[PDB]
């Protein structure tokens, strides 16, 4: 029925990265939707949208997320995930950072990313849309095939969760004891994201290379009740997953390895797709050849130092455009 959207976002050169040449190794064409990489010998790859080095946070949100957020409110499950080498901007893009000195409020911090922006807009868009709705969110991170709850307000972070097949959902799982915090309004948001960021920091003291190796699944489930002209009970449920994947360069890497075998299985149209053999592919089975509306943001470097992963990343992301999903709304 419908193709997975792939986008590419390149970041500006960082402090480590030397640029020798007068003209770029990575050129992004937003109009032609082409990323062109100098291996005058090139490989040019077309994507669904492309975002060069100076693309700001608000544009990414505007171009990619605003459209998807509308599908969430109709009650499609969506899933945006970020993919690419450590240091290209998967966390910058999906979470963002906090500007120093309290120069800006969270709502207006231009370093803010998809997660906080989205949560903010869910409340603006639904408050003046007439709907009866609630928002409850959760923050699960996978590391070494273990499940960490960063929003559980009480528990020690190293208390890890179990997963089991949802007896109500053919291609889904329930994460037992996962803290699903109800957000009653936008002013409850920051406090929740802070607690998430803090617990995360604690988990990093416990495990090696945690930032780069962890997958981070930040869900948000919109319950929307609506009365019909016929006097019925229209209860629709949007779910948006916002997934920050472990760095592409990596049992520690079982989930990332399996994500590859799944995508491979799907594109080459081989009958057995091994969702079941990793926690990530179990949690997101429905985002990959299922009934969810997936977008991948593939984050690349502009620089010669990281060309090899920049290109690995582009080939991996580009074959992912051939996956067909059959979106369905939850009532
Ligand atoms: C789980 O999703 C999150 C968590 C934390 C943040 C975030 S950015 C966190 C940063 N991505 C990180 O991993 O440390 C925040 C930072 C510090 C305190 C509280 C929040 C932020 C929120 C709104 C605006 C700007 C920055 C953003 C998204
Ligand atoms: N699009 C961007 N604009 C400005 N700075 C960026 C951008 N993407 C990444 N950076 C910076 O480069 C570093 C890498 O970001 P990070 O989100 O940790 O990457 P990842 O999560 O992909 O390992 C951070 O310091 C970040 O602020
Ligand atoms: Mg990161
Ligand atoms: Na264990």
C-alpha distance from residue 10 to each of 35, 60, 133 (Å)? 9, 12, 36
Tokens of 330: 């939850």
List alpha helices for the chain, DSSP H: 57-60, 66-74, 90-94, 114-127, 189-206, 210-213, 254-267, 279-283, 307-319
- Which parts are annotated binding residues? 84-91
Q: Tell me phi and psi for residue 203, to 5 degrees.
A: -60, -35
Distance CA 224, CA 135 (A): 9
Which residue, chain included where needed, has tokens 């911090």?
Answer: 109
Contacting residues for 271 by C-beta, under 8 A, at least 6 apart: none
Cα torsion 82, 91, 244, 190: sign: negative
Going along the chain from its start, the domains and CATH numbers come out as 1-331 (3.40.850.10)
- Which parts are annotated binding residues for ATP? 84-91
Does residue 243 sit in helix, strand or coil? strand
For ligand 1, is residue 197 a contact (CB within 6 Å)? yes
Resolution (A): 2.7
Q: Which ligand is nearest to the CA of 147?
A: 4
Q: 150, 137 in Cβ contact below 8 A?
A: no
Please tell me the residue having the least CA distance from ligand 2 atom 15.
89
Distance CA 77, CA 330 (A): 8
Neighbours of 153 (CB within 10 A): 10
Does residue 245 sit in helix, strand or coil? coil
Q: How was this structure determined?
A: X-ray
Neighbours of 74 (CB within 10 A): 12
Specify the pairing of strand 233-244 against strand 77-83: parallel
């Amino acid at each position: 029925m419908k193709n997975i959207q792939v986008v590419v976002r390149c970041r500006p050169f960082n402090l480590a990265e030397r640029k020798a040449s007068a003209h770029s190794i990575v050129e992004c064409d937003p109009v032609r939707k082409e990323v062109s990489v100098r291996t005058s010998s090139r490989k040019t790859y077309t994507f669904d949208m492309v975002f060069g080095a100076s693309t700001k946070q608000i544009d990414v949100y505007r171009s990619v997320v605003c459209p998807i957020l509308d599908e969430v409110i109709m009650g499609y499950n969506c899933t945006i995930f970020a993919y690419g080498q450590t240091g290209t901007g998967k966390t910058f893009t999906m979470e963002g950072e906090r500007s120093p000195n309290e120069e800006y409020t969270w709502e207006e911090d231009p370093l803010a990313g998809i997660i906080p922006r989205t949560l903010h807009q869910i409340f603006e868009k639904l408050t003046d849309n007439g709907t009866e709705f609630s928002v409850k969110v959760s923050l699960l991170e996978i590391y070494n095939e273990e499940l960490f709850d960063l929003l559980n307000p009480s528990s020690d972070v190293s208390e890890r969760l179990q997963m089991f097949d949802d007896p109500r959902n053919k291609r889904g799982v329930i994460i037992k004891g996962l803290e699903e915090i109800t957000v009653h309004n936008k002013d409850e948001v920051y406090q929740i994201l802070e607690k998430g960021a803090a617990k995360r920091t604690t988990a990093a003291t416990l495990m090696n290379a945690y930032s780069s190796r962890s997958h981070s699944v930040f869900s948000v489930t919109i319950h929307m009740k609506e009365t019909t002209i016929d006097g019925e009970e229209l209860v629709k449920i949007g779910k948006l997953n916002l997934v920050d994947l472990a760095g592409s360069e990596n049992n520690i890497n079982q989930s990332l390895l399996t994500l590859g075998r799944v995508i491979t299985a799907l594109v080459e149209r081989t009958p057995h797709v091994p969702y079941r053999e990793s926690k990530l592919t179990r949690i997101l089975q429905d985002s990959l050849g299922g009934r969810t509306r997936t977008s991948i943001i593939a984050t690349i470097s502009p620089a010669s130092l990281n060309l090899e992963e920049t290109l690995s990343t582009l080939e991996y992301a580009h074959r992912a455009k051939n996956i067909l999903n059959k979106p369905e709304v939850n009532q």
